[PDB]
């Protein structure tokens, strides 16, 4: 009955934890209180992009680190020039309240979603000199929170509906749904493209299996809505940003949370997190008004990027690593090294 | 300096500019809302009398409209979960919320109040002022009148209540009528004026279905808070 | 994508005539336009350019002046006036479509051009006509007075094929970057000293190849290298 399959999952779930508990045998503080601090990481801005009329949730930079995507509540993404500041594209949206974006890897396609409930993509590239919207991808039921490209065909989103979709862009049907008991806020790709890790309105973070499209392993241990979650480079560890003023470093293979990085000086939830090139590096942008740079591997602040007059909603790290930009509610972009 | 093509696409970046400041000039004179209720609020009654006078699964309803030549956007939410937790934080800069109210319900008039107080205390709308409509007046005009339920079954602090000195009946209303509505109404302001201290101010209205003032309740409760941010950016408080 | 052209035909000399050019297809407003002329037996030459907005106008030293060019973006139609005309102005004139972002490629799409009958940067290609056979692999060099590497790291030259009664299309832009529509046989090389290379041709390769800086202004081609079979 009921009650039966009720005791049936709490048993599942102490065998679960007792087999995570099982496999602590060192503590990755402990391994690294070894390894050199990586010191004061006296980060510099370089840039400043200004032209969004309004806040800015969503950036992404492209695979050439060098051609930016930003999405702004005036309705508006706007392509930047990261090395010249100039304004490559300016991108009306039939939608204003936006709060992803996502740059596809070959750069022929942009993404944009919110409030509206679609996955709109935007073709770059095309005979007539006008970015185009390629398609409107229609079918959850929330708020899309997060959107990106396997390739130029298929794209994950997760919405508010607590459910993630892979889609087909030919043809605009969710080629397969990821079914999370709160609003789901972002979503993080492997390297390999094959998995991607979701975190949700329920302090747990899940990795899915794409081509088969079931719940391959779940993740525990905030307090509060996750906001923000990254693969470490490694493709077998992803890190989660949340409402509890807390960074959470899970691995895969262990099945468990590794480490947490957290200090008593700030209180502010967690809105965006990047990883460095080297995984060394962990970038966190916060409510505090600033981006806070952590050591994965110490739990030591290592570094603070302080330009925004305003809440830091976006953070992304460059495909080689060069700089790394971070968009406020300021309506800036700044472009540290 | 600059080859003949960057000097192009600097030129590119200078026309976008252009229509960026062309588009600032239209986005600082338009005036952004957050239209929030519940089923039994006549809020879908009010954007059809509203738009009228001035996509299966879509989260978000645009209604435009126009008073005294400035254009207002009110914003629906209708596909949408029960959590607003989130979603809600997209909505710290807009200008008011207007939260429609059914007055007439005493059964989930407690849900509205908690629904109120959740908007009124959240951290994202701590600078943001709530128009507050309390529709469906005619309905507890008439539920008061043909008297079959009260109020002190529901809220046992009506009978230790009177209709405060500072009221405007309207003309040929009955007393009993007006302390119902006022009480409602003291019971949304009270947790109004419980915190917040200046930043924020909730302005009642009392509406019906087929009103048309609610433009310009809105409009004029639009000026008031525009005035008291500029009161407060151009340092005269 | 589609660029006609309009208003040339026998003018005495001395007289004056206005060259239209009606763009349908595209985003007139965004892009730059480019009147580039070309002699009855000669190679391509560049006449002028108007920029998005209209605020860059540029001219060949040999029509500033008794030239003018012009635009009108809600009417999507370019204008070329010209005065005082003189024998060297005999030519077929070509409408040229060229935005400028970053990735961009100019000059990527070019009109039909009028015939127009009357009563620096040096570009050298050394080579003027090349017999060639279908199936082998052909390269075209071009040389320049001035290196075309800038410092942002773009080396400035430009691949065009003009076939037979037919108007130039791109083939490289950038010296290494492949127009869109064009296969892949194509392929540019350089650093001063330039080269095409073409493999596996086939027979629709036949024609005239032209390269182009774009470095600075004036935008000056080359003779151009004849593929004959």
């Known amino acids: 009955e009921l009650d039966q399959l009720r005791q049936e999952a709490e048993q599942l779930k102490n065998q679960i934890r007792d087999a995570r508990k099982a496999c602590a045998d060192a503590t990755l503080s402990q391994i690294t209180n070894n390894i050199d601090p990586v010191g004061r990481i006296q980060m510099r801005t370089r840039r400043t992009l200004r032209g969004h009329l309004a806040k800015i949730y969503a950036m992404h930079w492209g695979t050439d680190s060098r051609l930016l995507v930003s999405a702004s509540q005036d309705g508006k993404l706007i392509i930047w020039d990261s090395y010249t500041t100039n304004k490559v594209h300016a991108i009306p949206l039939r939608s204003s309240w936006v709060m992803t974006c996502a740059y596809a890897p070959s750069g022929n396609y942009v993404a944009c979603g919110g409030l509206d409930n679609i996955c709109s993509i935007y073709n770059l590239k095309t005979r007539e000199g006008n970015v185009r919207v390629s398609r409107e991808l229609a079918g959850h039921t929330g708020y899309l929170s997060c959107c990106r490209f396997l390739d130029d065909n298929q794209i994950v989103t997760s919405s508010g509906d607590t459910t993630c979709a892979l889609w087909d862009i030919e043809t605009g049907q969710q080629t397969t749904t990821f079914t999370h008991t709160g609003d789901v806020m972002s979503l993080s790709l492997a390297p390999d493209t094959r998995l991607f890790v979701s975190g949700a309105c329920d302090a747990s973070a899940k990795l899915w299996d794409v081509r088969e499209g079931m719940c391959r392993q779940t993740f525990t241990g905030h307090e509060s809505d996750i906001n923000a979650i990254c693969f470490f480079p490694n493709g077998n560890a992803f890190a989660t940003g949340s409402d509890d003023a807390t960074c959470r470093l899970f691995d895969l293979r262990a099945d468990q949370e590794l480490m947490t990085y957290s200090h008593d000086n700030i209180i502010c939830g967690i809105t965006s997190v990047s990883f460095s090139k080297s995984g060394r590096l962990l970038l966190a942008g916060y409510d505090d008004f600033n981006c806070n740079v952590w050591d994965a591997l110490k739990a030591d602040r290592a570094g603070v990027l302080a330009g925004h007059d305003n809440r830091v909603s976006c953070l992304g790290v460059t495909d080689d690593g060069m700089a790394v930009a971070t968009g406020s509610w300021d309506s800036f972009l700044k472009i540290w090294n | 300096t600059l080859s003949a093509e960057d000097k192009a696409a600097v030129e590119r970046s200078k026309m976008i500019e252009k229509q960026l400041q062309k588009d600032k000039q239209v986005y600082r004179a338009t005036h952004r809302l957050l239209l929030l209720g519940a089923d039994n609020s006549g809020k879908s009654t009010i954007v059809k009398q509203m738009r009228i006078y001035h996509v299966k699964t879509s989260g978000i309803f645009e209604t435009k409209f126009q008073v005294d030549k400035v254009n207002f956007h009110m914003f629906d939410v209708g596909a949408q979960r029960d959590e607003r937790r989130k979603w809600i934080q997209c909505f710290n800069d807009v200008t008011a919320i207007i939260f429609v109210v059914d007055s007439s319900d005493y059964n989930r008039l407690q849900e509205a109040l908690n629904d109120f107080k959740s908007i009124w205390n959240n951290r994202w709308l701590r600078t943001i002022s709530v128009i507050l409509f309390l529709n469906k007046q005619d309905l507890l005009a008439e539920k008061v009148l043909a008297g079959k339920s009260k109020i002190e079954d529901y809220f046992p602090e009506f009978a230790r209540y009177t209709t405060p000195e500072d009221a405007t009946p309207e003309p040929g209303e009955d007393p009993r009528v007006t302390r119902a509505k006022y009480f409602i109404r003291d019971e949304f302001l009270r947790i109004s004026t419980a915190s917040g201290d200046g930043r924020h101010y909730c302005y009642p209205h009392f509406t019906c279905s087929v009103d048309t003032e609610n433009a310009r309740r809105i409009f004029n409760d639009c000026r008031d808070i525009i005035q008291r941010m500029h009161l407060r950016q151009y340092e005269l408080l | 994508v589609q660029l006609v052209e309009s208003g040339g035909g026998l003018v005495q000399p001395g007289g004056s005539r206005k060259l239209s050019c009606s763009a349908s297809?595209?985003?007139?407003?965004?892009?730059?336009m480019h009147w580039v002329r070309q002699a009855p037996e000669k190679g391509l030459e560049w006449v002028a350019y108007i920029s998005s907005g209209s605020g860059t106008i540029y001219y060949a030293d040999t029509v500033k002046g008794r030239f003018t060019i012009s635009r009108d973006d809600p009417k999507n139609t370019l204008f070329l006036q010209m005065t005082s005309l003189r024998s060297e102005d005999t030519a077929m004139y070509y409408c040229?479509?060229?935005?400028?972002?970053?990735?961009?490629?100019?000059?990527?799409?070019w009109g039909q051009g009028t015939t127009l009958t009357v009563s620096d940067i040096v570009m050298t290609q050394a080579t003027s006509s090349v017999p060639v056979t279908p199936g082998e692999s052909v390269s075209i060099s071009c040389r320049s007075s001035?290196?075309?590497?800038?410092?942002?790291?773009?080396?400035?030259l430009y691949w065009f094929l003009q076939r037979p009664g037919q108007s130039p299309q791109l083939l490289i832009y950038?010296?290494?970057n492949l127009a869109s529509g064009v296969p892949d046989r194509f392929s540019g090389s350089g650093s001063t000293a330039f080269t095409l290379t073409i493999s596996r041709l086939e027979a629709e390769d036949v024609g005239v190849y032209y390269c182009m800086q774009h470095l600075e202004y004036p935008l000056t081609f080359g003779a151009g290298t004849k593929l004959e079979l």
């Open positions: 297809g595209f985003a007139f407003s965004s892009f730059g």
């Open positions: 950038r010296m290494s």
């Open positions: 040229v479509r060229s935005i400028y972002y970053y990735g961009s490629s100019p000059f990527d799409f």
């Open positions: 001035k290196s075309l590497l800038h410092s942002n790291g773009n080396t400035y």
